[PDB]
């Protein structure tokens, strides 16, 4: 039949049908459960709200993400999320569709083994496949030679590829991503007086970060400009009518990516991580990797991240090489479009993990096949 492509990220679930060019279902990956006391009979029978129905009712729920840093910490909640995706959002019986799941590199092996076991034993899919996300982003970028920075909500990882041959020793996975930026924005928002503490208020702060925050080209000059004048202050209106105003927190939140010492992490920024991943590859392909820096994932959509990253890498690379960062306008959905390209290929249809193979070899077949 037609294959499903479920890109269950750490923050958003993006599902669809293979061969298309856009997902059908795009909902947050949260599972709320009511915490207050129900007083009207018949209201309160539903124990847990999943996805978009827990984002509307978040005033009386404790939203809990099942996937946390790309690793599925809670498995019952993630079964709930997958059931929602298959039946209530896409409205397809899983028994008739192969499913192409995505996964960050360098995750635990139990993660793939349990995703395979759940798909083949609970949802009874006829076939499946687990693909690294940056490979799919390079599929959807229309190339075969690049270094794929793939931020997100859980992790931020690079995968350098030269002409279809990935270099597994130069894959650099960093655990700094959108959720850490949300928490840091909450922290620095406490300075102005605004205290967001609950989970629903985490979602409000996430929306503030998406709407207002941007990346400064030169950090010190922008701090000087923000301190000298109030030209950088922009106002946001909370769900209860209150108006906030953040002037200096706008570029301080996404600067955590380039200086992960803001949140106490030791590792180098994403620019030094990309450059170190480039100079771990063979000498002959560094020129081709410099010119194709595919950026993917949601977190790489801050206004001004491509220019800043080009400036930061150009100061590290030799003066001769041509650095240019590829930032497609649709880069939030690049992984899923790559899943559509991969799952609908004529060549690929011999690479599904069929149910018969899983019955023969158990959940450890995913390590051989994928």
């Amino acid at each position: 039949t037609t294959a499903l492509v479920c890109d269950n990220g750490s923050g958003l679930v993006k599902a669809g049908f293979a061969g298309d060019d856009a997902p059908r279902a795009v909902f947050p990956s949260i599972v709320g459960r009511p915490r207050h006391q129900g007083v009207m009979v018949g209201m309160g029978q539903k124990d847990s709200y999943v996805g978009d129905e827990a984002q509307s009712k978040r005033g009386i729920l404790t939203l809990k993400y099942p996937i946390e840093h790309g690793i599925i910490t809670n498995w019952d909640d993630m079964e709930k999320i997958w059931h929602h995706t298959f039946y209530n959002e896409l409205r397809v019986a899983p028994e008739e569709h192969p499913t192409l799941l995505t996964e960050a590199p360098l995750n635990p092996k139990a993660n793939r083994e349990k995703m395979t076991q759940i798909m083949f034993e609970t949802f009874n899919v006829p076939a499946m496949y687990v693909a690294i996300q940056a490979v799919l982003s390079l599929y959807a970028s229309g190339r075969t030679t690049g270094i794929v920075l793939d931020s997100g909500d859980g992790v931020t990882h690079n995968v350098p590829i030269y002409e279809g041959y990935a270099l597994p020793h130069a894959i650099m996975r960093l655990d700094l991503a959108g959720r850490d930026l949300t928490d840091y924005l909450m922290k620095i928002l406490t300075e102005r007086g605004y205290s967001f503490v609950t989970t629903a208020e985490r979602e409000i702060v996430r929306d503030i970060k998406e709407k207002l925050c941007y990346v400064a080209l030169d950090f010190e000059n922008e701090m000087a400009t923000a301190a000298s004048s109030s030209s950088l202050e922009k106002s946001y209106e909370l769900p209860d009518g209150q108006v906030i105003t953040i002037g200096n927190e706008r570029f301080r939140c996404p600067e955590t990516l380039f200086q992960p010492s803001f949140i106490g992490m030791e590792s180098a920024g994403i620019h030094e991580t990309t450059y170190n991943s480039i100079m771990k590859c063979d000498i002959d392909i560094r020129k081709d990797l410099y010119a194709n820096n595919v950026m993917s994932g949601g977190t790489t959509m801050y206004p001004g991240i491509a220019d800043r990253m080009q400036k930061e890498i150009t100061a590290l690379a030799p003066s001769t090489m041509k650095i240019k960062i590829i930032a497609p306008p649709e880069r939030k959905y690049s992984v899923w479009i790559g899943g559509s390209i991969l799952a609908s290929l004529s060549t690929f249809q011999q690479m599904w993990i069929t149910k018969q193979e899983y019955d023969e070899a158990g959940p450890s077949i995913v390590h051989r096949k994928c």
Partner: protein, 159 residues
């Protein structure tokens, strides 16, 4: 890339003309898009570049089918394996061109040059994998049990 086809002069000799014609159309569209990159060309709108990319993808599917027919007609050899590898590459590039063209069309409709840069890159990858498909198919069908001129003399002194 054009020169590799241009050395063709007039199994093979039954489906050869179709393949060489398809490759020539591909090169014509390719330099159409290249001239768009340089600024002056037959097509000037990004929508035109997307249409050209879809056209190249269609020609790629047709040439892939023809070259597969020649490949299974021919006998086991090393050039047959090279031909099959290049056919797989053409399949991947055609799928990329289709889906990426649709995505760029939607992105442009929802409201510049960098939108067409990746389509040009993928079409150029496709074209590079065709001029190695016509040559491998020609050799596999002919030399084992149109024309290509013998290669030019290499310079004795290189300045």
């Amino acid at each position: 890339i054009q020169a590799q086809i241009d050395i063709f002069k007039v199994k093979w000799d039954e489906t050869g003309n179709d393949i060489i014609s398809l490759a020539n159309n591909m090169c014509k569209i390719m330099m159409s898009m290249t001239e768009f990159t340089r600024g002056c060309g037959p097509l000037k709108t990004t929508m035109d570049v997307i249409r050209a990319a879809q056209e190249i993808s269609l020609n790629g599917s047709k040439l892939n089918a023809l070259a597969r027919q020649i490949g299974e007609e021919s006998a086991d050899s090393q050039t047959k394996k090279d031909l099959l590898a290049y056919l797989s590459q053409i399949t991947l590039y055609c799928q990329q061109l289709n889906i990426c063209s649709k995505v760029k069309a939607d992105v442009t409709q929802v409201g510049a040059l960098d939108s067409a840069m990746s389509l040009i890159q993928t079409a150029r990858n496709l074209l590079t994998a065709v001029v190695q498909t016509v040559k491998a198919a020609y050799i596999a069908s002919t030399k084992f049990r149109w024309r290509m001129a013998p290669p030019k003399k290499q310079p004795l002194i290189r300045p």
